[PDB]
Amino acid sequence: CPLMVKVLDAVRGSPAINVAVHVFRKAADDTWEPFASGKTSESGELHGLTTEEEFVEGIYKVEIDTKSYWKALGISPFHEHAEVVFTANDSGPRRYTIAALLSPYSYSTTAVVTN
Amino acid sequence: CPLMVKVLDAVRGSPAINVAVHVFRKAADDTWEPFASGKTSESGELHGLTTEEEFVEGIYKVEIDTKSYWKALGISPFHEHAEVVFTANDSGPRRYTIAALLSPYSYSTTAVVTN
Amino acid sequence: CPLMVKVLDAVRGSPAINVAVHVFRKAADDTWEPFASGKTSESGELHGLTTEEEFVEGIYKVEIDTKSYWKALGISPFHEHAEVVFTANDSGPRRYTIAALLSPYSYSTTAVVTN
Amino acid sequence: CPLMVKVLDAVRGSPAINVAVHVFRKAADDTWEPFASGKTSESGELHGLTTEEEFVEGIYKVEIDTKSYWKALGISPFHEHAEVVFTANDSGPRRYTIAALLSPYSYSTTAVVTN
Ligand SMILES: O=c1cc(-c2ccc(O)cc2)oc2cc(O)cc(O)c12
């Protein structure tokens, strides 16, 4: 799989478990077309979202449902969700890890792009 | 000034100047209506986006045009933009500062909410 | 004011108030000599630590007492403190803002260096 | 191994490879005693630093030589190094991952503590 999502919890110092993640691909008419989704595992990771054959060049949006995550922990959050929007490019390395570090009023995200 | 945006550059250790910012508000029909836009000053700050009267309750999206920023500096970055999505003024008027710290393959964002 | 420290709380979405900060400078004998100290205000800022005359070239350590901050709020955090270590004024006098964003098991820090 | 260090590069969107890491344990006289060290791998990770038997409760410092890393890439950095100082506690989960995300004028660090 060319796309993995990893989510961490900066309040508890843990993986962020059972977080819903939705991936969209930008269509020709600039709408967001559902592409893949899942929930992070006990290690905070979401594997197997797509395949090399399906993951063609284009703009993708990864939506991480941070609000539901914080509410399930009894914590009041700021954001509706975290969004990561990027272009997949065949010129670069083949594997994309989208990582996010979550706090109630803040988040960080980085891309780790490797061969 | 109930909505302010502040952007920093983590490569240069400086304000991120001339960063375009577009704000949207979710409409009754569930689309993103353009609400306000502007660009960061030499201090990396964007003031005057809206007014207390105009900044009513709603779900807002602050889109920070990070790709256009990096590309204007001769850099090819990872993200298209940073999107900050939040419910505002649910418990009455507040003042919101949306801060963002930018790197070519990573960003963080935090909200400072007062009064 | 050539050295300023600003601290934010990522759990509350607020300035981090009453955070103790201790600054050290590496001595000729390679030990950390106490240089200045203070605490953040209601704005999360710490001004007046030093003067242009006193803030000479050197290697400085800014220790932000994050554990004491979280514990004063009834929270058991991970880190003892955040340490920011840097060479200052190597190319002549500059103004340094050390910013830190705090969560119980995570922090970030960035420097804004001007003139 | 109860202690792992992971380092990421926010400029290149990659693991931070061949970064020197030094771990110290705080001695009874408040000095820092060398404990373990190594260099991050091609995946940006440093495994096998210590064992369960050696990693007793106490205060530890993880020093990440960020300055040499940026210089080897031809980039001018701000910090001398990144420091992560924490107490190992047997009450919590047994495995500590210290992660750091590096930019030239900024870094983030979080702890992922698991069983
Ligand atoms: O999101 C951030 C915002 C800020 C910041 C820094 C200075 C301000 O006057 C306002 C906000 O610093 C930071 C420092 C970091 O290391 C990481 C951040 O996300 C931020």
Ligand SMILES: O=c1cc(-c2ccc(O)cc2)oc2cc(O)cc(O)c12
């Ligand atoms: O976005 C982040 C991702 C990670 C990370 C941690 C472990 C992985 O296997 C992959 C990514 O650590 C971090 C540590 C930080 O202090 C801040 C981050 O944004 C991240």
